[PDB]
Design a protein around this ligand. Sequence first.
Ligand SMILES: Cn1nc(-c2cc3ccc(C#N)cc3[nH]2)nc1NC1CCN(C(=O)c2cccc(Nc3ncccn3)c2)CC1
Lengths: 116, 120
Amino acid sequence: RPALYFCGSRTLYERIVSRLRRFGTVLTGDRLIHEQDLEWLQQADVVVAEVTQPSLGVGYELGRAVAFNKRILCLFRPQSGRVLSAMIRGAADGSRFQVWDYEEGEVEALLDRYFE
Amino acid sequence: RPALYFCGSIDRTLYERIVSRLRRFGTVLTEGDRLIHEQDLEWLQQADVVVAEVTQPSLGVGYELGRAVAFNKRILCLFRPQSGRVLSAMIRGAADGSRFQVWDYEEGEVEALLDRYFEA
Ligand SMILES: Cn1nc(-c2cc3ccc(C#N)cc3[nH]2)nc1NC1CCN(C(=O)c2cccc(Nc3ncccn3)c2)CC1
């Protein structure tokens, strides 16, 4: 079973993490936080990020994750009214780095599809 | 002269103040979406120092910081506590006071602290 890393680590994030648990071990002062998170990132097989909300922390985890050569899945909701960053959208190669647009209600159906 | 990379969230007057000061010390490289990404990565690889204004939350600024760390770049993150925001623990904890620095600043001292950083 794969070691999974979930970025930005409320009820929607808990839904993502519960579904992630069905496929593998979800591994997930300030210096200690960073060191602990980078050690988990380094040991992950799949890195999942919910990129709807602008976040320096989520972006930094993705940047380190690409440089660590991990398989990355980004989940974005266009119904939020936001336009996803050109840097995250442009990092997508449709294979080891995918950006999936989704609706709140299809988060379980999409994760099942990705992990099967 | 050295190559300098600047980034900030997509306010613009402050970024122009930072870039205008950066020009004194070197060439500011950064003054469909796949093409934006590749050009940014080439510029990141060419830079000797990466400067990010990290007051405004941004997935893009974060991602460029993540990629710069793995390219072993000299990084300066500028943060304004007077914005009322609390800087991300990830970016705060990424600093080591040497190759990756996170400096708090006030709007009025942006020219003086870039002088202190690049004159050292
Ligand atoms: C490379 N770079 N350069 C500067 C930079 C800021 C700045 C301010 C003042 C001056 C002066 N004088 C010069 C400046 N240069 N910011 C950056 N990176 C930022 C990283 C976060 N962003 C994103 O995630 C983002 C989000 C949505 C769309 C796009 N579209 C996009 N289109 C084309 C190119 C770049 N981006 C990007 C915005 C861009």
